[PDB]
Design a protein around this ligand. Structure first.
Ligand SMILES: CN1C(=O)N[C@@]2(OO)C(=O)NC(=O)N=C12
Ligand SMILES: CN1C(=O)N[C@@]2(OO)C(=O)NC(=O)N=C12
Ligand SMILES: CN1C(=O)N[C@@]2(OO)C(=O)NC(=O)N=C12
Ligand SMILES: CN1C(=O)N[C@@]2(OO)C(=O)NC(=O)N=C12
Lengths: 301, 301, 301, 301
C-alpha cells in the first residue's frame, strides 16, 4: 500500500475576540468556529509510526488562538489567509493549509433606539463562511459563502411546463409558496500570496454584502418560474458586480408547503384560490444546484 | 394495576397559515408547531383494548388544521384556547386538553428600504410559545414564553463574593463576558373560559413585547452582579407592567467564555485587562432558574 | 416582588471513569452527563446581589468530579444519591439537591469471539438515566429510566374500533407497522437517606434489566390492539416484578409508516396485502403517555 | 454568464421496504434515506425558464418508490446502480445520475434467546452508505462506506515523538484514551454498467463486513502510536482482502478525554498512573484523514 492523499489538523475550534475602543467605550465582538487541516511530507506518520513530521493538532489549536491575538480576525478571508500562510511558511515540510471558518452573528443591540456599546444579539443562525486553501507555490484559493439564510415568499412563485410522463403525479401550479435555506458561494480569482489578498481587503465585506442584497431582492421580486431560473438570476448579478469573482454557486433546498384538502369536512374550501392553511413538509425536499461563470461562447449563443 | 395518569394526542404538527389582503396586496404568514394531548375517561383504552374512547391522534391532527382554517391563529394564546376548548366541548368524555404551540419567526423583508408585501426572513430561531391547559370545570391556564433568545455582553458583568471553600477554584472577577439563551415564561391568571380569554386578547401581544423589551434592556444596561441578580430585575419589571400575570419564570444558561493564557508563547498578554481572545465553552454550563411572584410579606421584610 | 421558587447549578457535565483490574488486565469504562441543581436559603442572591449564599456552579462541577473519584459511579441511582447527599450535608443553607444523570453506552467489544479487555463500542444511543431528588428532612426520591430505545415491528399491530365522527379520515387497520422510541420510567419508594439507598443497591441494575427485558418481549410478542394497550401490559409486568417501585410511566411516540398507493403507475399493487414499500413519516407523530400504579379499588372493579 | 455545472433532484427521501416469507413467517425490514441528483442538457431551465427539460423532483421521488417496489433494495450498491441507470436510460437528455443512500439499522430482536420473526431494534446509529455515480458513456462509480461507528479504548494508545516548538504545549504520553467516530470508505473499480455491478453482487455485503471487522479488530488490538498509524493499518488490510477496491479512505476525529488534576483538593491523585476520572471534550477535536491505494513504487521504496 501507499498513501495517495492525507490531511490532518484541528476541527471545531471555537474562537471569540473582542475589540475595545477605550476612547469611545464601544466594544465589538467576533465569534467563529475554525478548522485547519495540513498537508505535506507527512506520509511516514501513517506508514512508519513517524511522529516527528506531525505538528500536533493541539499545537495547531494553540496557533489559531495566537494568530487571532496578533492579527485582525476580520474579514474572515484575510484571517484565514494569514493563518494558512503561517503553516506553510513556518514548517518547511508542510505544503498546504486548508482553513475553514464559520462566522457566527453577534449583531449590536439597539436599546431605546440607540446602538448599545457592548451588548449583542444572535439575530439569525445565518453564517458567513470562508474556505481558504493556501498551497505552497500555488497561492491562495478562497471560496466565500453565506449559508443558513432561511426565507419564504407566499406568492409569486410558479412551477408549470415541466416534463410529464408515466412517473409524474405533480400538478402544475401558477401560484405557490417558495421557501429555501440559501447556501451561496463566490469563488475568487487565485491570489499569489498574502500581499495580494491584503490588497483586496475591502472587497471581501463589500462582496458579501452584495451577494446577500442580490439574494434577498431577487428572491423577493422575481415572479419565479422555478428555483433554477431564480437562482441563475442571482448568480449572474453577483458576477456582474465583482470582476474578481470567477464563479458563483447556489445550493437551494425546495422546502415544500403542501395544500390541505379539507372538502371532506363540511365542504371547507382550502385549495387553490382559497388555500390558507398548509402543511410544511420536513422531508423529502427538492435540492437544486448550479455553478455560474462568465460566458466564452462567441457563436451559437 | 391501575392507570394513575394518562394523556395522548398528536405532537409535532407543523402548520402554516397565510392572510391575503386582496385590496392592498399585503400578505402575512404564520408558522407554528402544535401539540395537543387529551385527558379524560380513557383508561379502558389502556386496560381493556377499548378503542371506542379514543379520538384518534390522526383526527386530532385533522382538527388542528380545520381549527386553523376557521379561526385566527394569532395571538397563539387565543388559538390554543379555541383549540383546547373544542376538544372538551365536542367530546363529553374528554375533560382536559393540553395545547403547546411553538411559533416560528417569519419577519417581513425590507427591500430597498420598503416592506415587501409577500416575502419573509427567518430573522432569528428565537420562538414565541404557549402552553394552554383547558380543564373542564376549571377554566383555561395559560403560560406564555419566549425562548431561544441568544445574547452576549462583552463587559459590565461581574461575579465575586461567592462562597469559597475546599471545593472552590474559581477566581473572582470584576469584568467578564456574559452570554445566555433566554427562556422566559409568564403565567396568566386563570381564565374561566374562552370568553374571558377573548376579553384580554390585546394583552397577549403587548405582554410578549414588554417581556422581550425588558429582557433586552435589562441585560444590556444592568452592570450585573450575577445571573441571579439580573434575571430577578427582569421578572420584577414584567410583573409591574401586567397585573394579569401571576408569576414570571426565567431559565438561563451561563454560557462560559474562558480566558486563554498565552504568556507561555513569547510573553503574549491575553488575560485580565489585556484579554482579547477567548475560548467559548460548549459544556458544561451554569443553569440558573427562578420563579418570581408578587410579595405578601407584611413584617420582617 | 418575591422569589417563589429558585434552583441553580451546573448542567451538561461530561464525566468518564475507568476501573482497571491490575491482576486480570480487564478495564471497564463509564461515561455520563451530569446535572446538579441546588435549592435552599438562596433568595438574597437574586434579590440583594448577595453572592455569599452561592456555592458557585464551577465548584459544583469540581464536586461532581471529586465525588466520582472517591466513590463508585454505578449504579447511577447510588452515585446520584451520594452526590446529592453531599450538598445538603456540607452546606447548612442548602436544603435540596436535584441530580440528573444520563448514562452513555460503552459496551465491551468481542473480537474473534472473545471479550476484549479494554475496547468498547457505543452499541446504541439508548440511555439509562436517573433523577435523584435529595431533600433535607424528606429523604431521597429516585426516578430511574431508559430512553432512546428505538424499535419496530413489521406486523402484529392493529388499530381499529376508534371513535369515528366528522373529524375522522383514518382507515381502520388489522395489520400495520408499529415503531417507537421507548421512554420508560420507574419511580421508587421514598428512601430515608443514603443508608437505605445503599441497602437496595443490587435492585437498581436488576430492575433496569427487568424493565428493558419486559419492554422488548412485550413489544415483540403482543399482537397489539393499540400503543395504549401494549404499553399498559409492560407497566403492569414491571410493577409485578419489583415491589419497591410505586409507579411505571411510559411515553411513546407513534412513528408512522404510511402506505404508498402506486396503482396510478402501471397498476402496481402496493397497498393492503401487497404493501411492501412504505414512506416513514418524520412528523407529525402520535404521542401516547400513561402512569401505572397498583390498584386500591375493592368495589366496582 | 453561463452555467458551468448544474445538478438537481430529490433529497431526504425516506424509504422502508419489507420482505415477508409466507412459508416461514419470517419478515425482514430495510430502511434508508435516498438522494438522487441528475445532470444533463438542463441548462435552459436555469437560463431561459425552460421547464420542459426538468424531470420534476416530485417525479424523481415517485421513481425512487416505484424502483424499490420492483427491485431488491439490498445490497445498496445494487439498488443505487439500478436507480441511477433508470434515469440515464429513460431520459435521453439526462446524462448522469448521482445516487446517495444512507441505510439505517434494523437488527432482528432476540427474545428468550430466539430470533423474533418480525421485531427489530435500532442497535446503533452507525450507517452503511453508498454513493453511486452513473455517468452515461462512463459506467458506474461506487463508493461504499460505514459511518457513525463510535468506539473507545481505555489504554494501548500513545502519542509521543511529535514536533515540539514554540507553539507546543502538549505533553507526550505513553498511555491515553483513544475514541473516535469511524467514517471508512472503499472505492470500487469502475463498472461498465449494471450487468457488471450485478456480476459482483455478493462482494458488496462481504466487503462491508470485512471493512467493519478489520476496523474493530485493528482498533482493539493495535497498541497505537497515533491515529495516523492505526488507520493506515486498517486500510492496508482491507485493500489486501478485496482486489476490486482501488482505494480506502478513513476520516477519524480524535475525541479527546482530558485528565483532571485534583491535587488541589485534599492531595487527591488523579493523574498519570492514578488517573480514573476524565473530562470528555466536546470540542475542539483532532481530525485525521487519509486515502490509501496500492503501491506502484519499484525503487526508493
Ligand atoms: C415542485 N418541484 C419539483 O417537483 N421539482 C422541482 O424542484 O423541487 C424543480 O425542479 N424546480 C422547482 O422550482 N420546483 C420543483
Ligand atoms: C461563574 N459562575 C459560577 O461558577 N456559578 C455561577 O453560575 O454559573 C452563578 O451562580 N452565577 C453567575 O452569575 N456566575 C456563576
Ligand atoms: C393511528 N393512531 C391514531 O391516529 N391515534 C393513535 O395514536 O397515534 C392512538 O391513539 N393509538 C394507536 O395505537 N394508533 C393511533
Ligand atoms: C493528541 N494529538 C494531537 O495533538 N495531534 C494529534 O491528533 O489529534 C495527531 O496528529 N495524532 C494523534 O494520534 N494524537 C494527536
Amino acid at each position: 500500500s501507499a498513501v495517495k492523499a492525507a490531511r490532518y489538523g484541528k476541527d471545531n475550534v471555537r474562537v471569540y475576540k473582542v475589540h475595545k475602543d477605550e476612547k469611545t467605550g464601544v466594544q465589538t465582538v467576533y465569534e467563529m468556529t475554525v478548522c485547519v487541516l495540513l498537508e505535506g511530507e507527512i506520509e511516514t506518520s501513517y506508514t512508519k509510526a513517524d511522529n516527528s513530521v506531525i505538528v500536533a493538532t493541539d499545537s495547531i489549536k494553540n496557533t489559531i488562538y495566537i494568530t487571532a491575538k496578533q492579527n485582525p480576525v476580520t474579514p474572515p478571508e484575510l484571517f484565514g489567509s494569514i493563518l494558512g500562510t503561517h503553516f506553510i511558511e513556518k514548517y518547511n515540510h508542510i505544503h498546504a493549509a486548508h482553513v475553514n471558518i464559520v462566522c457566527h452573528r453577534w449583531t449590536r443591540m439597539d436599546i431605546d433606539g440607540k446602538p448599545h456599546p457592548h451588548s449583542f444579539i444572535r439575530d439569525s443562525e445565518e453564517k458567513r463562511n470562508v474556505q481558504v486553501d493556501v498551497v505552497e507555490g500555488k497561492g491562495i484559493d478562497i471560496k466565500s459563502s453565506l449559508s443558513g439564510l432561511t426565507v419564504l415568499k407566499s406568492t409569486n412563485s410558479q412551477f408549470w411546463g415541466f416534463l410529464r410522463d408515466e412517473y409524474t403525479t405533480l400538478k402544475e401550479t401558477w401560484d405557490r409558496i417558495l421557501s429555501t435555506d440559501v447556501d451561496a458561494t463566490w469563488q475568487w480569482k487565485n491570489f499569489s500570496g498574502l500581499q495580494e489578498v491584503r490588497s483586496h481587503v475591502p472587497k471581501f465585506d463589500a462582496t458579501w454584502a452584495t451577494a446577500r442584497e442580490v439574494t434577498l431582492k431577487t428572491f423577493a421580486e422575481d415572479n419565479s418560474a422555478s428555483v433554477q431560473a431564480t437562482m441563475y438570476k442571482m448568480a449572474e448579478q453577483i458576477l456582474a458586480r465583482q470582476q474578481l469573482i470567477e464563479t458563483v454557486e447556489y445550493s437551494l433546498p425546495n422546502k415544500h408547503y403542501f395544500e390541505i384538502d379539507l372538502s371532506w369536512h363540511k365542504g371547507l374550501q382550502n385549495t387553490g384560490k382559497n388555500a390558507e392553511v398548509f402543511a410544511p413538509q420536513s422531508d423529502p425536499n427538492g435540492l437544486i444546484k448550479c455553478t455560474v461563470g462568465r460566458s466564452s461562447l462567441k457563436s451559437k449563443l
